[PDB]
PDB file of C-alpha atoms in Angstrom:
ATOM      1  CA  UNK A   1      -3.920 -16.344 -11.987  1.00 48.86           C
ATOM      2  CA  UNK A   2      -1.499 -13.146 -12.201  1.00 51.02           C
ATOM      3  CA  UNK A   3       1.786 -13.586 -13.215  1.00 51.69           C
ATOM      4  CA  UNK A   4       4.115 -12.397 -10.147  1.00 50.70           C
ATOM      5  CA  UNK A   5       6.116  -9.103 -10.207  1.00 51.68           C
ATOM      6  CA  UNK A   6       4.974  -5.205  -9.466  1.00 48.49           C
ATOM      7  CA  UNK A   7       2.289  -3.474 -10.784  1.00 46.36           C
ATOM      8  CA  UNK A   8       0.087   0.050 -10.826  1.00 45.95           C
ATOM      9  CA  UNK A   9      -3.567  -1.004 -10.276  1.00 45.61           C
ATOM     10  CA  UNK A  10      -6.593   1.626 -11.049  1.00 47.94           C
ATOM     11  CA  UNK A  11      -9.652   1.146 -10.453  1.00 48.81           C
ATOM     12  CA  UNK A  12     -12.308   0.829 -13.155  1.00 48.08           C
ATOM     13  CA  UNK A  13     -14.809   2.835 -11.967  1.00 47.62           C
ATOM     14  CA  UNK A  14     -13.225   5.765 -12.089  1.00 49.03           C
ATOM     15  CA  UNK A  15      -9.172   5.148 -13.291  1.00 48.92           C
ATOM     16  CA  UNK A  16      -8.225   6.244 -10.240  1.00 48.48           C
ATOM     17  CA  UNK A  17      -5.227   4.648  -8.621  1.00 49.00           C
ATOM     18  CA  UNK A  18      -5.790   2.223  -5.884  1.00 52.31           C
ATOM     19  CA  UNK A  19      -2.827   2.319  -2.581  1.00 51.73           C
ATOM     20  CA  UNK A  20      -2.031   4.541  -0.044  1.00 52.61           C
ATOM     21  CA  UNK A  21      -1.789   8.284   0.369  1.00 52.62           C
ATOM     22  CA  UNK A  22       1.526   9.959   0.696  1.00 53.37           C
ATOM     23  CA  UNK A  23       0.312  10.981   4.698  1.00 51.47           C
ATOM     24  CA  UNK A  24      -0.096   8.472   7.157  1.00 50.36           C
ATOM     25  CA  UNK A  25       0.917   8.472  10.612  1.00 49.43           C
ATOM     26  CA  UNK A  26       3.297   7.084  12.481  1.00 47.86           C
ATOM     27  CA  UNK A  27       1.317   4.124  14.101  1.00 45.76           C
ATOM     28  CA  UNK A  28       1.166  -0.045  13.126  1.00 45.26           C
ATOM     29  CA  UNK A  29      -3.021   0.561  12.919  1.00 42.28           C
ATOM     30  CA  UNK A  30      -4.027  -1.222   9.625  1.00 41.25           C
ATOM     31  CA  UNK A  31      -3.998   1.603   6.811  1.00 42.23           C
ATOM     32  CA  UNK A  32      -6.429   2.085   4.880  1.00 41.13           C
ATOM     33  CA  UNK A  33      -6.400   1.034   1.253  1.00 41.30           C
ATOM     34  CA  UNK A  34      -7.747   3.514  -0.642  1.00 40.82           C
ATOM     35  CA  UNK A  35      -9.035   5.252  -4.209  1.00 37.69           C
ATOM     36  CA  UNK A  36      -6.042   8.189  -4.700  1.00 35.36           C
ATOM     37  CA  UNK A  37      -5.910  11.046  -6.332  1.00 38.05           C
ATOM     38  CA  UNK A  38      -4.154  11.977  -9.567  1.00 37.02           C
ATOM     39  CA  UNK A  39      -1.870  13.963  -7.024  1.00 35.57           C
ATOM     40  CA  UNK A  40      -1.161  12.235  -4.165  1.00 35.34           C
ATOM     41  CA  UNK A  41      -0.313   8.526  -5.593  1.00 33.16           C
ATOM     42  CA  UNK A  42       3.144   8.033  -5.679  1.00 34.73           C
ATOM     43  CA  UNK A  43       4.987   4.896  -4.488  1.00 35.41           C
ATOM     44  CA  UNK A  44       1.800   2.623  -5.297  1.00 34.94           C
ATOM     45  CA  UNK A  45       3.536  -0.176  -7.407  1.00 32.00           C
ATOM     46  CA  UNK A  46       1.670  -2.914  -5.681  1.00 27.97           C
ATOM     47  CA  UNK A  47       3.941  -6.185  -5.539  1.00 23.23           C
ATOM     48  CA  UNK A  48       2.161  -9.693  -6.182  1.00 22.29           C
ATOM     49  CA  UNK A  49       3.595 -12.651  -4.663  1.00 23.15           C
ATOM     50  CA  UNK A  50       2.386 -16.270  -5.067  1.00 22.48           C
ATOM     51  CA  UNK A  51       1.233 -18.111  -2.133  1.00 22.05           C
ATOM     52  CA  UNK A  52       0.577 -21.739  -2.766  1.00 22.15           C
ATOM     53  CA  UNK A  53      -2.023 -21.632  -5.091  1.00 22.19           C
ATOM     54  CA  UNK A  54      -3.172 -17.532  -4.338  1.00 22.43           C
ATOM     55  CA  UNK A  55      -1.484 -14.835  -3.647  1.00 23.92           C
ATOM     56  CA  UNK A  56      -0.218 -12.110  -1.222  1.00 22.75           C
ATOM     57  CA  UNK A  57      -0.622  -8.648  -2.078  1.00 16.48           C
ATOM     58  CA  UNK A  58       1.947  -5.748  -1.190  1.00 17.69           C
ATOM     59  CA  UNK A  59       1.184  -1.647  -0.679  1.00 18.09           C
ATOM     60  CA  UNK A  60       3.987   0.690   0.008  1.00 15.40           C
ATOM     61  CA  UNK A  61       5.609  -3.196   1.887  1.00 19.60           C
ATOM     62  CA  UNK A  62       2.407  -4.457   3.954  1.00 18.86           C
ATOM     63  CA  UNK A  63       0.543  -7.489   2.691  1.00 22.34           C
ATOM     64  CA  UNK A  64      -3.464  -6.410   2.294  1.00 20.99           C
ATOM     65  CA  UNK A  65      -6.554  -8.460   4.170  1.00 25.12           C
ATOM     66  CA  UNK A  66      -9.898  -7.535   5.163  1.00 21.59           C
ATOM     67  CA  UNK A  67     -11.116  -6.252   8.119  1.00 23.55           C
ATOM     68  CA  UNK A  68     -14.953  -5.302   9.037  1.00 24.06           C
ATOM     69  CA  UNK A  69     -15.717  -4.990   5.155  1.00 25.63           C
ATOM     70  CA  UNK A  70     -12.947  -2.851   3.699  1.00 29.12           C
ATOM     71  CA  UNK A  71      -9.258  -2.977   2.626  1.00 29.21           C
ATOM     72  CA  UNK A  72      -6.249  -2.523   4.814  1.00 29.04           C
ATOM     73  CA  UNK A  73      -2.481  -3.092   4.921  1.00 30.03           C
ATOM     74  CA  UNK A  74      -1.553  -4.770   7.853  1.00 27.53           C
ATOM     75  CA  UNK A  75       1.453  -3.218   9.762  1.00 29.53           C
ATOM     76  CA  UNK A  76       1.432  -5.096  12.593  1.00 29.72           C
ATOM     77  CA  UNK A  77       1.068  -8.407  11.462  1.00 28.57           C
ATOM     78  CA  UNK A  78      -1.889  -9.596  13.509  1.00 27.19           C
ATOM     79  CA  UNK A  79      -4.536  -9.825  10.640  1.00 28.19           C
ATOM     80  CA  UNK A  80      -5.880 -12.817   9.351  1.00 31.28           C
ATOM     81  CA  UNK A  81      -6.572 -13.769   5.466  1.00 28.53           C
ATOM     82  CA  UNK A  82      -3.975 -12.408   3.644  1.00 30.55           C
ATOM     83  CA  UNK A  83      -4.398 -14.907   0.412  1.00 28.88           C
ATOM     84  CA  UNK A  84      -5.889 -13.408  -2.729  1.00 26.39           C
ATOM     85  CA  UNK A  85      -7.491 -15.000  -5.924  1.00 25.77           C
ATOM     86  CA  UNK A  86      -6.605 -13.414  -8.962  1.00 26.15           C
ATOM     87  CA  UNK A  87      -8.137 -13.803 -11.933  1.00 28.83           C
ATOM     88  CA  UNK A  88      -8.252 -12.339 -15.292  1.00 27.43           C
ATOM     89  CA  UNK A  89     -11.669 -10.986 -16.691  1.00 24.92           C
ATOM     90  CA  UNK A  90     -10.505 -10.835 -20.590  1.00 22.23           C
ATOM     91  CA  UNK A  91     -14.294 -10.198 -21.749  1.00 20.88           C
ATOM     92  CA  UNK A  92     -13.382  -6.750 -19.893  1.00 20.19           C
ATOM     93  CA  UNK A  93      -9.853  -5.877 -21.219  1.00 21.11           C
ATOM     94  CA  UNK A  94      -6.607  -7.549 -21.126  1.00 22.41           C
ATOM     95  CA  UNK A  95      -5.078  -6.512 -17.994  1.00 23.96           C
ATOM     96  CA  UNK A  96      -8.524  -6.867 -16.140  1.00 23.61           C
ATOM     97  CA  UNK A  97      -8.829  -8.542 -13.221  1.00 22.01           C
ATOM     98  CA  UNK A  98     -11.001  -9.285 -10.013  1.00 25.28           C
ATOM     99  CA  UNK A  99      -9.670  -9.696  -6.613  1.00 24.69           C
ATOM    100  CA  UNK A 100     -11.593 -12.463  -4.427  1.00 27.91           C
ATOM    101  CA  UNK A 101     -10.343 -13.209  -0.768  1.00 26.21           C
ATOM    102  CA  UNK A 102      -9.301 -17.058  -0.777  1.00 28.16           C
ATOM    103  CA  UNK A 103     -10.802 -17.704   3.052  1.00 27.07           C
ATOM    104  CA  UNK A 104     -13.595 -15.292   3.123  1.00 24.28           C
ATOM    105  CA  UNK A 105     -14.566 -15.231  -0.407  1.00 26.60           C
ATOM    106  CA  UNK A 106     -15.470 -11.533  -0.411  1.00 25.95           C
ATOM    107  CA  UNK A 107     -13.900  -9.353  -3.369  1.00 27.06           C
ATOM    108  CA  UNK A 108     -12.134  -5.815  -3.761  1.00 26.62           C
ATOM    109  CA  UNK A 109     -14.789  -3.228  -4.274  1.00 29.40           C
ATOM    110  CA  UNK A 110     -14.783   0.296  -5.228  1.00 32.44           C
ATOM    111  CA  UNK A 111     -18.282   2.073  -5.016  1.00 32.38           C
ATOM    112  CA  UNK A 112     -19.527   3.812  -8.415  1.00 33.99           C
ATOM    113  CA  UNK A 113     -19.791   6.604  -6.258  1.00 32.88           C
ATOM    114  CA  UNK A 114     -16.793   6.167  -4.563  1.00 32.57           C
ATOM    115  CA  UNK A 115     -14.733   9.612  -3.504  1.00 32.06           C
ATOM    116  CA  UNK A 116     -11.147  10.477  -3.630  1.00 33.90           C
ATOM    117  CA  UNK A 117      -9.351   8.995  -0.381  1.00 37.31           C
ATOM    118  CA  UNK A 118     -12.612   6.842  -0.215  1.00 40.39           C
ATOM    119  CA  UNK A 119     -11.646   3.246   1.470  1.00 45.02           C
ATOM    120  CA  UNK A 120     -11.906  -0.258  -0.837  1.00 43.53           C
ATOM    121  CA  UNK A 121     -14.533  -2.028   0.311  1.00 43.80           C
ATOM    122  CA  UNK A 122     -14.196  -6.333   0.769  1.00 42.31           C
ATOM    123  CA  UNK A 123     -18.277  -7.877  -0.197  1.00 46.27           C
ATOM    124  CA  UNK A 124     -19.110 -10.836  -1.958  1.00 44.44           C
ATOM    125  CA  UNK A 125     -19.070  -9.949  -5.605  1.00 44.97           C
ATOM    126  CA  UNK A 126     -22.431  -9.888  -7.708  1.00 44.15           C
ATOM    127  CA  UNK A 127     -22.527 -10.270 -11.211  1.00 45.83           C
ATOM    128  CA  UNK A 128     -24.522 -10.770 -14.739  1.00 43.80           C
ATOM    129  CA  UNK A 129     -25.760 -14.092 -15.249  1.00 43.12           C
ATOM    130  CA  UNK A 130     -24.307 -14.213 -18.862  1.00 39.32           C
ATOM    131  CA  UNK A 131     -21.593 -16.557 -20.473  1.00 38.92           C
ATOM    132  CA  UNK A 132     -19.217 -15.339 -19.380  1.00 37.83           C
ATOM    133  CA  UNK A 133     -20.339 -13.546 -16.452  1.00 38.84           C
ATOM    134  CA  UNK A 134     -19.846  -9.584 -16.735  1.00 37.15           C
ATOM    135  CA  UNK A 135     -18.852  -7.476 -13.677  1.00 38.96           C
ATOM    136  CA  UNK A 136     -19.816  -3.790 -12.180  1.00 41.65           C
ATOM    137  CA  UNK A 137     -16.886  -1.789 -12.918  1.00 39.96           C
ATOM    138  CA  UNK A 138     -16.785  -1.360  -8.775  1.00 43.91           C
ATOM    139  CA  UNK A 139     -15.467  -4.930  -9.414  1.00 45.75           C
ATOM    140  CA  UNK A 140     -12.611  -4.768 -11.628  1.00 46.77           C
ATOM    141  CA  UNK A 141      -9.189  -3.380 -11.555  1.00 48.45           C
ATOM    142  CA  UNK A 142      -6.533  -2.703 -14.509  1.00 44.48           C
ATOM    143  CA  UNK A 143      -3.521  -4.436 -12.891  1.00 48.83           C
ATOM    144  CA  UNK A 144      -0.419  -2.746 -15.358  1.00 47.49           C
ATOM    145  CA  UNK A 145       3.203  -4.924 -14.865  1.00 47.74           C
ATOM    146  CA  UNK A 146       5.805  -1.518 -14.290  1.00 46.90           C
TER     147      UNK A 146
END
């Protein structure tokens, strides 16, 4: 669970931001969600909404869902699971979380080797098989109420 309202999410990998890029054109394609840089990250308070018992998840006013493995916001409206489970990882920090698609059951991931602009990937999650269980970095995001 995630307590509703807006919030800055980085990646842990590498801090970076996680949204969208100040460019994009002028089309209702799916954007891409992506790592950003330091630079070009603006406007990227995220807004969580509950949905039953997940959640919906805003960038610059789209909800997010997964398409063919990675990360979009859907413009147009067409695109199918759009409800997130959110949970804390406390074992990692306080504001840790993962991100696990409620239908699919395939989670936000950022590769270690992930470049800037570089796409967030949607793949089951793996993790250690320790109480509790600890998580890749390319797993876990800092979710930071504004």
């Amino acid at each position: 669970s995630i307590k509703p309202g807006t919030y800055e999410v980085t990646s842990k990998v590498n801090g970076l931001h996680v949204g969208r890029p100040l460019a994009e054109d002028r089309s209702l394609l799916p954007k891409r969600i992506r790592v950003l840089p330091e630079d070009n990250n603006s406007g990227n308070s995220w807004v969580v909404e509950k949905d039953d018992d997940a959640y919906i998840l805003y960038c610059k006013g789209a909800p997010v869902a997964p398409q063919e493995g990675k990360l979009f916001a859907d413009l147009l409206g067409n695109m199918e699971d759009k409800k997130w489970i959110v949970t804390h990882q406390p074992q990692h920090g306080e504001n840790v979380f993962t991100v696990v698609n409620a239908s699919t059951e395939h989670g936000w991931v950022v590769p270690a080797d992930a470049e800037e602009l570089q796409q967030v990937e949607v793949r089951p999650l793996i993790a250690a098989p320790s109480y509790p269980p600890r998580y890749p970095a390319t797993e876990l995001f800092t979710f930071t109420q504004v």
